[model samples]
Target: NKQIFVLYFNIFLIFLGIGLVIPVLPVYLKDLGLTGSDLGLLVAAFALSQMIISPFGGTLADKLGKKLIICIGLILFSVSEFMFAVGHNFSVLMLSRVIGGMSAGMVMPGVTGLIADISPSHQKAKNFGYMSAIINSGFILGPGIGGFMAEVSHRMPFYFAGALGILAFIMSIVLIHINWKVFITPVILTLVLSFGLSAFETLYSLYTADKVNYSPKDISIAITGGGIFGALFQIYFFDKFMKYFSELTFIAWSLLYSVVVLILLVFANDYWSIMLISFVVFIGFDMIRPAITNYFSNIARQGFAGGLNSTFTSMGNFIGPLIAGALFDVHIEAPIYMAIGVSLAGVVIVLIEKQHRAAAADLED
Candidate 1:
């Protein structure tokens, strides 16, 4: 239990470090003359590198230990942020993002697996919920602080993020402690859900800037708002939902809510409307992780849970942004539709799983 708390703290620090840069990146890069497609490419580059590294990183972590792997990830994150702070050219920036992605691939899945290690089977959902809340707390604080710091200088946030990453690196080394095979159904579902969700997230700031004419400050605030809402939902509602519904039911409802939000996002042209809707969207988005984590954690081949989770998530992250980027080049709204379709497809998967379970139960009876 105490070890779990330490793990939570580490998660908060790493996510806070990463979140600090997200709101500012699009605006900062735009000023440097990159287009919407370029932003998508930048996001995709990070996801692609993560895709390459995540499963392998998890496997290595299983062999080498979670602490060493986590430290490596934090070091990479710090270096990447520092590079982003200093780099001026497109190639340098992309390289930095790729490194950052690799960092995430190493760190996050390891953390997930570690939590599974420490948590009791019945308490998995509760533990994952707390973990989600800690992560979102970082998100809540990071962009808000980053936005305010950007008022001082756009480069300031990167410096801050880099510094924070270093701090996390040190903490991972000093305060360390311990930590799947693949289930195809969960993997496929995770892939579809993340692809749809990441598409919206990757495009959100750019969409606002282009269509809604929001300022950098506004975008930052909106993102922070979403984070706060997500955290609150995780804290107040997730456990209750878990208690009342099976994981599959919870996931189906969550995706159903998301599909509605994606459709609404297509037509939301004003800042306030977008913000309100996005807040609700994030609630749905945030709900997916803990529920899915609970489901997958239970089924994962012991010791490989993290790798399995990271592999599916990495695939979604890689595919989602690339698809969104390509579609974004054609029309910003196009990606939202894509997200809707993908989310709907996930809902279909849930229904199929439900039917299968019911059929098996009937046969046993």
Candidate 2:
């Protein structure tokens, strides 16, 4: 019990540290002279590298050891963070992001897998709440703090991220432990899907600010509020809805959220209008992730659990940006529609999986 608490807390800290750099990264790249397609590619590089290598990292975690992989991931991320600080040009910056994203890809899936491994079923949702809170607070705090720190020196925030990542690596070495195994296939599929999803988020945020002309602070504030909305949805809606909902139902709901939110985004005429839509979008976004997280958590093999999740999530990190960049080239709105379509596709995948599971069960009987 005490061990689980410590583990979850540490995970929170790692995410918080990571989140600190996210808010300012786009703006920083813009300052470095990246615009539109170039900016999208820069963001995509992280996911691209992650998708390519993350599952292998997870498989290595399973084969060699989970703790070792985690530590290595942390070291890699820290190195990348410092590299980002040193980068003065777009190409160098994208390279740094690729490395950092790869590191995060290796590390994050394991984080959830580790927590879910130790969490008792009865309290899983509650414990997950704590995890989500910590990560989202990082999201809230990252931009606020990064924005402030960037005003001082853009390089400072990356240094801070690098230092904190190293701290997390050291802390993990002292604290968490796990065994590992092959979980590569599922990881690949998840990454492929995640690439599109994350790309959507990156492109949409950029579109709202750069294309639509909203203030950074306003967008940040809306995102923060969405985090709050997400927390509320998790506490109030997730458990209540999930009890009776199949994975298919959850997927449908998520797609609905995507469609409705994207449509609302199209209707946004002012910053406030966009802000309101952002809140709704994130609410759905937040709710959908945990639903999937818990589902995977439930199904994950015991010893290989963290490794399993780590692979899948890293895949998502890889895919989201690549597809987003492709669609983004078509038009700014292309990514939004693509997100909605992909999320709907996600629903189809869930149903297909559900059918396969049912058929397998009948065959076994």
Candidate 3:
């Protein structure tokens, strides 16, 4: 009865992370002189990596097993959030999205597959319903909390989410009953992402509105367009595109592509420019969520992976704008320049990280 609560809580966290970033925070970032393209790209960056990495994430879960994979994914998600929280630029934020994508990939499959893995079929369906409710709850509350949190400081939401990831990691192993003792090692990691996702969405809107004297409705259009772009990519090209590379390879380079766009976001002045660029940024991430989920499921690491993917998604989504919002108030033209600076650094770091792989597994390390 209660085991699924963790899943519910976990899924809730993922949506919360996403919800947080979609609203008030982007305007805040925009106020810092971002074009709609640049702002939308941040989310596009996040979505691109997230959507692309899903299937591979499932494979990893299957190989790593749920407990270890989910646990690591949570920490991975935490690290990504901290990076985003303090990134202060597009490059860092871009990399942050990729990490979030990679981590989310692992957990998504882990959670769903594990639920099914340990489930006796009857309870699994009931549990799925429970988690579904939590997912809807996240949609309702995620941005709701973040926009209000901006009252204190938009950054508050991300820090809150990052810390939640850590605490949940601990909790994953701590409390529980022996009746389901067989499955005792799996849980949480998502609420951490949930509690923190609000800032990105709420702040960036204000951010963009002020910096360019752009209309709020304009902001709405770009984000909405980005979603169409995202959906289109997933529906038509997701499978065709994924065929060309390893999921890990896709995670790295697609995120790298996202990073490049974030640095370029500053140059997109018109709504049309923003739209095209946002398309570039949002393209691959929609594929990532499924990649990670499928990867984890393939290797038999479902439940924990499921939770971890969400944790990472929420955590990444949660923190991207804490720093974005913080910087929003510091300088109207500040965040974009910083984004450029960090992007250069991001490219270097990503290049380096991409160098090491093949740790005796069928996946990337």
Candidate 4:
């Protein structure tokens, strides 16, 4: 727990750096003369690379040890980010994001796996909630810090991200250590899954604002609202939701809400209409994450809760944007429509997997 506290402090600082960069990134890219397609690809590249390498990072964490992986990730991310100040063209900018993603792949799973290792079963939910809340606070503050800093220099956030990440790397080496061996297959799987899902989410937000002309404030508010809902649900409603809906049903509902939100967003002309949709979609998002996590925790054979969660989430983050980016080129609405389709696909996967698990349970009984 002490190690977790230490690691989180460093991690939170690093997030602050990243957060400062995010809100202004699209605007910066637009300034660079990239079209909508280019914008999507530019942002997607980093996440896609991270998704590709996250499983590798997870394996490395398992085989090489969590502290080493964390240090390596922090160093790579920091160095690349620091260098981002010099990039004058789209190609150079894209490269920085790619390197940053690779670093993320290494660090996140390692941290997640470490937390999973130390958390007791009875307290897993509480501890997980604690970490989520702490990290999210960092996320909220990161944007404010980054946005304010950007006024001084557009490159300021990248420099800040690099600096914080380096500090985290140092703390990891000095204060935290763990033992594990990295493996390949699980890492790769994590990358792929994370890439697809994340790509969709990122693209969805971009399209909502860029294509639909939704104001920046509204988009930001919608996501912020989702996070608040997630935190509250975990605290009060998760247990209640679990009692009534199967994990599969919860997953389905999560995907359903995302689909409905996107669909309605296409038609929404007023700010309040969009906000209402955002709140509902996020409510669904909050419900699904815990429900699926509960199922994953029950099913994992090796007892690596952090590794498993990070792996899946990371993979989705990596892939989702690329897919969304590609769709944006064809039509502004393509990404949103695709997100709905992908979420539905995820629903189908959960249903099939649930049935299979049920059949296996019956056989055992």
Q: Tell me, by TM-score, which candidate is best.
A: 1
Evaluate model 1: give its TM-score. Answer: 0.81
For 202-318, candidate 3 gives per-residue lDDT tens digits of: 333554566566454455455555555665676797687678776546655654565566556666677576657655654544454455455545534465665555555545443
lDDT of 4 by residue, 211-297 (tens): 556544445566566556655766788787778877667667667766777688677767677667655655555565556556556
Residue 226 alpha-carbon offset, candidate 2, angstroms: 1.3
Worst 10 residues of 1 by lDDT: 173-182
RMSD of 1: 4.6
- Sort all candidates by TM-score, best to worst: 1, 4, 2, 3
lDDT digits (tens) for residues 22-63 of candidate 1? 567577657787766676677778778877887688789889
Evaluate model 1: give its lDDT.
0.76
Candidate 2 clashes: the total is 11
> How far is 226's C-alpha from truth in model 1 (Å)?
1.6
The candidate with the higher TM-score, 1 or 2, is 1
Q: Which 10 residues in a row give candidate 3 its minimum summed lDDT?
A: 184-193
lDDT of 2 by residue, 62-163 (tens): 777666776787788788888878878876777787786677567765666676666778787765677767765664455555545656665777787777
Weakest 10 consecutive residues of candidate 4 by summed lDDT: 178-187
Poorly placed runs, candidate 4 (over 4 Å): 1-3, 13-22, 51-72, 109-153, 166-197, 211-218, 303-312, 350-365
Error of 1 at 13 (Å): 3.9
Distance (Å) between predicted and true CA of 285, model 4? 2.2
Give candidate 1 misplaced runs (Cα > 4 Å).
1-10, 54-73, 105-133, 136-142, 167-182, 298-300, 363-365
lDDT of each: 0.76, 0.64, 0.56, 0.62
